C-alpha cells in the first residue's frame, strides 16, 4: 500500500502517567519461586500517581510475555523452565501503564549433581 503524514493539533484527555521506570529491579530465586523487587516510581505535581505495576516476564524467547498485577513494589513468579527469562517492571497508573525498566536476565536452573555426600 502506501502511507502518508502532515500532522494536526490535537488536545488532551485524562492525566498522564510518569514515565518514570522503577529502578532498584532486583531479583531473586529460592525454594521454588522467584522474589521480584524493585524501587518505587512517584509522579510530579499533575501527574498520575503509581498505583501498581506489572510485571512482564517472558522466556529468552517468547511470542507474547504476560503480564502480573502486583499492588506492591514486590513480585513472585515461577523457577524458570529453562532459557533465561526477560523480565520487565512496568509502573501503571489510573491513567494506564508506564515505562518498563531494564529487561531483568534470569539464567534457568544450574546442572549439577544434588546430593554430595
Request: glycine fraction near 8%; avoid cysteine.
Amino acid at each position: 500500500g502506501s502511507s502518508g503524514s502532515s500532522g494536526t493539533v490535537n488536545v488532551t484527555t485524562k492525566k498522564t502517567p510518569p514515565s518514570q521506570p522503577p529502578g532498584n529491579v532486583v531479583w531473586n530465586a529460592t525454594d521454588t519461586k522467584v522474589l521480584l523487587n524493585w524501587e518505587q516510581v512517584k509522579a510530579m505535581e499533575n501527574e498520575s500517581e503509581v498505583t501498581g505495576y506489572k510485571v512482564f516476564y517472558r522466556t529468552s524467547s517468547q511470542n507474547n510475555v504476560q503480564v502480573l498485577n502486583t499492588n506492591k513494589t514486590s513480585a513472585e513468579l515461577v523457577l524458570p523452565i529453562k532459557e533465561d527469562y526477560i523480565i520487565e517492571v512496568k509502573a501503571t497508573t489510573d491513567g494506564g501503564d508506564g515505562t518498563s525498566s531494564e529487561q531483568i536476565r534470569i539464567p534457568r536452573i544450574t546442572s549439577s549433581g544434588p546430593s554430595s555426600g
